[PDB]
Amino acid sequence: DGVGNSSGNWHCDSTWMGDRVITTSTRTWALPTYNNHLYKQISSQSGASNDNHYFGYSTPWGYFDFNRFHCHFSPRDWQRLINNNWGFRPKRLNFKLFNIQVKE
Amino acid sequence: LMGGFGLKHPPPQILIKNTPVPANPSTTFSAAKFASFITQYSTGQVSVEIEWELQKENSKRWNPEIQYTSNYNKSVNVDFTVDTNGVYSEPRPIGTRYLTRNL
Numbered sequence: 001d002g003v004g005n006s007s008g009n010w011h012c013d014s015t016w017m018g019d020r021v022i023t024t025s026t027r028t029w030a031l032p033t034y035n036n037h038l039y040k041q042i043s044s045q046s047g048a049s050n051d052n053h054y055f056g057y058s059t060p061w062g063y064f065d066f067n068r069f070h071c072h073f074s075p076r077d078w079q080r081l082i083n084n085n086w087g088f089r090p091k092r093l094n095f096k097l098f099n100i101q102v103k104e
Numbered sequence: 105l106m107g108g109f110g111l112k113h114p115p116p117q118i119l120i121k122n123t124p125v126p127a128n129p130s131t132t133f134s135a136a137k138f139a140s141f142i143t144q145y146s147t148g149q150v151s152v153e154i155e156w157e158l159q160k161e162n163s164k165r166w167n168p169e170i171q172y173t174s175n176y177n178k179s180v181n182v183d184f185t186v187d188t189n190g191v192y193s194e195p196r197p198i199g200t201r202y203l204t205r206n207l
Contacts, residue, residue, distance in 0.1 A: 079168045 008098025014077045020091070021081070023072035034060045064095075122146055161203050171202050 001007065012026040037060050044053045066072065073081065081088060127140040163169075174183060181187050183195045 074166060075168060076163075076166055083171075 006099060008096055014074065016080065021077075021088075023077065025066070025072055029064075031062050034058070034062060064097075161205075163204065165204065169203055172198060 010026050011024045014021060014023045035058055039060070040058045041055075042058050043055045069078065122144060124138070125142040125144060126138045127142055129138070184193075186192050
């Protein structure tokens, strides 16, 4: 766990081995400072429709989402999925964050 | 050259023949061969069971490939299907070269 030592490798692959397929992705991200480290009450403006009124909070926190099928399937891997299978479902996932560089 | 598998020892010829059943011979001896036979034919069932070895594909191709498909557009007759008279027909020749491979 050092400065000049990699903490993970690029895994971006898909393996079909029977009744299972494992889809692995890897992406590069960038996380800025959100709200200048503040929590802020957000709401709708006072001049707005009643359907569009909201109340909530924004955080300094970012979030990772991979809730799209193209995040894990290529179009060729999606074509293998849909012309050969009557059904599919997820079983387990594995998540990693690595090679983190904080730039000032 | 017509396509296929060249075999030094191919699947052998399977030859079949009705045994000649003669009609009634003359009650005196005749050294001539029989030209009169009982007219008969045979029927039955035939089964061939071939095992084929497959070669799966390992392409790292991104975009989708050309494949043999049926068209969804409606028609009076479904392809590779009997018609209203019970006549089976094959509409087109289907080759086997649809996936791709790099040289």
